[PDB]
C-alpha cells in the first residue's frame, strides 16, 4: 500500500481476504510469506480497476450578491461541484467541493471577479476520483 503499483501513490479504501495457501516444513519463513503476499497484491491490483484519487476541498466563499453569479461560474469552470448557497445579511455564502489541483491562485481570480471584496475558507473533505483526462495527466 505504501507504494501503489500504478503511479506510486499511496493505496487507500482497499481491503483484502486471505482464505487459502501452502507451506514447507524447512523452506517456509515469515519473509517468504511477505514476498508471496507482495506478488499476489501486485497481480490483483493490475486486474482490479485501479483509479487515482484527487483530494477534494470543502470551500466556503463570502461574496457580494452582485458577483455571486460570477463566483459560482468560476467554481463551475473548475471541476468543483457546488453543494450549498446561504444568503446572508452581509454577503452571500457559497459552499462547493473543488479538487485542490483546481484550487490554485483561486484568491487572485476571486478578487478580480469581486473587486477584492470576497474571501474564501477551505478544509480537506475526501478523495473523490480524478476525471480521466486529469488522472492520465497525473500518471504521466
Amino acid at each position: 500500500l505504501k507504494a501503489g503499483p500504478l503511479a506510486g501513490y499511496p493505496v487507500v479504501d482497499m481491503g483484502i481476504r486471505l482464505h487459502f495457501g501452502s507451506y514447507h516444513d524447512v523452506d517456509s519463513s515469515e519473509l517468504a510469506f511477505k514476498l508471496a503476499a507482495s506478488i499476489a497484491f501486485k497481480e490483483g491490483f493490475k486486474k482490479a480497476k485501479p483509479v487515482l484519487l484527487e483530494p477534494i476541498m470543502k470551500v466556503e466563499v463570502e461574496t457580494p450578491e452582485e458577483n455571486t453569479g460570477d463566483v459560482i461560474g468560476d467554481l463551475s469552470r473548475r471541476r468543483g461541484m457546488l453543494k450549498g448557497q446561504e444568503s446572508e445579511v452581509t454577503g452571500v455564502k457559497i459552499h462547493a467541493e473543488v479538487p485542490l489541483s483546481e484550487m490554485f491562485g483561486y484568491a487572485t481570480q476571486l478578487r478580480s471577479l469581486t473587486k477584492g471584496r470576497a474571501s474564501y475558507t477551505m478544509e480537506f473533505l475526501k478523495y473523490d476520483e480524478a476525471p480521466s483526462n486529469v488522472a492520465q495527466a497525473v500518471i504521466e
Partner: peptide
C-alpha cells in the same frame, strides 16, 4: 500537497 491547512 496544496495550501497552509497542510492536506494533499
Amino acid at each position: 500537497x496544496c495550501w497552509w491547512g497542510x492536506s494533499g
